[model samples]
Target: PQITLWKRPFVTVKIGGQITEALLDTGADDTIIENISLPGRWKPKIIQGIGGFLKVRQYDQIPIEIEGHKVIGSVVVGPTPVNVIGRNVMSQLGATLNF
Candidate 1:
C-alpha cells in the first residue's frame, strides 16, 4: 500500500481583511478563510456536498502567491483554525501528493 501526502505554504487572508504566509492543504476542495469579519452587505451561502450542505457565504477574491505562483480566487467567509489551499488551486499548479 502507498499513501500520498503533499504540503505547501499558505497565506492567511481575512474574510474582509488580509494576512500573509499562511499554511495550505492540497487535499481540500474549497478554500478556507480564517479570522473572517462579516458585514451586513456580505452574506454567506449554503455549502453543499455529498454529506449534505452547510450555510456559508462568499467573501472576496484574494490574491495568493505560493513559491512565486499566484492565483486570484474567492474565499469562503467563515471561522477556520487555519487557512487551507484547496484542490482547485492546486490543480492549476500541477501538483501531486505522494506519501
Candidate 2:
C-alpha cells in the first residue's frame, strides 16, 4: 500500500499472537512496542529518544507480521507513546522512503 506523507503512517501489525497498530518510522533505529507479552527471556536495557530515556526489555528473534509481510527480528518492550516499526524490521521488509 502506498502511504501519503500528509498523515502519520500507521499500519496493522501482528506480533506475539495479537494484532496492533504500529507506525512505520524510518528514523527509529529499533522496533519499540508497549503492553505486549512475548514468550522469552528479555534483557533489561535503556534506550534514549528525542525526549527522554526509556527503560526497556529487549527480546530477540521475535516474529512480527507487518501488513502481512513477516520478519523475525529483535523487539524492545517498553512504555513507548506508540508502537513504532524501526529500521531493523523495515530493512528486512524492503521498505524504502520515497516522496
Candidate 3:
C-alpha cells in the first residue's frame, strides 16, 4: 500500500470570460495563464536572462476558485503546457511549501 504525503488540487478560472483548469504548483514563483485572451493595457515586463531580456507581460485579473477558495490576481498571458497556480494564490490561502 502506498500513501501520499501531500494532495494538490487543480482549479478552474475565468480568463477573458473563458473557463479553464490549471495545476496548482507551489514551486512556481509567479502565476501563469496559458493561451490567454489579450486585452488592452497588457504590457509585459522585460525579464533579463542568459539568452536575452524577455518580456514577461502582465494582464488583467482573473477570478479563480480552488476547493471553493476564491482568489483574484493579475496573470501573464502566454503559451505554456499547463496553467500554473503560483505564489499569489498560495499566499491568499496561507499555504506553505514543505520540501
Candidate 4:
C-alpha cells in the first residue's frame, strides 16, 4: 500500500494470529515487535535504535503478514516504544518509497 510522508506509515501486521499495528521503518535493518510472545527458540541480541542500543531476542524465520503481504524473516522481540517493520521484512513485502 502507498502512503504519504505527512505522517508515519503504520500498517496492520499479523503474527501468530495476533493483529498489531507496526510502523514501516525503511531506515531500520531488522523487524522489531514489541511485547509479543513468539514460539520457538531465540537468541539474545543487541540492536541499535534511535535512542541507542537495546537488548532483545531474535527469532529467525518467523512469518509476519504486513497489510496483505506475507513475509518470513527475522523478528526481534523487545520492549520497544512501538512495533517496527524494518527493511528486512519491508523488502520482502515489496514495499517501496515513491515521490
Query: For each candidate, what is the lDDT?
Result: 0.58, 0.88, 0.66, 0.85
- Residues 8-87, candidate 4: write the lDDT tens digits: 88888887667888998998898888857898899989888778898889999888887677778888999888899899
Model 3 is weakest, by summed lDDT over 10 consecutive residues, at 1-10
Please give, for residues 21-71, the per-residue lDDT of candidate 2 as tens digits: 899999999999896888879988798898999788999988889777888
Question: Which structure among the candidates has the greatest TM-score?
Answer: 2
For residues 10-97, write the lDDT of model 1, one tens digit per residue.
Answer: 4443323355434556556877655545455445667544566777766555665555567766666555556666776667667776
Model 1 global lDDT (CA atoms, 0 to 1): 0.58
lDDT of 2 at 74: 90
TM-score of each: 0.58, 0.93, 0.66, 0.91
Which one wins by lDDT: 1 or 4?
4
Query: Candidate 2 at residue 70, lDDT?
Result: 80
Candidate 3: list runs displaced more than 4 Å.
1-9, 47-56
Give residue 72's error in model 4 in angstroms: 0.8
Candidate 4 ranges with C-alpha deviation above 4 Å: none
Q: How close to the true structure is residue 53 of candidate 2, measured as C-alpha lDDT?
A: 91
Better of 1 and 2 by TM-score: 2
Give the better candidate number (3 or 4) by lDDT.
4
Candidate 3, lDDT over the whole model: 0.66
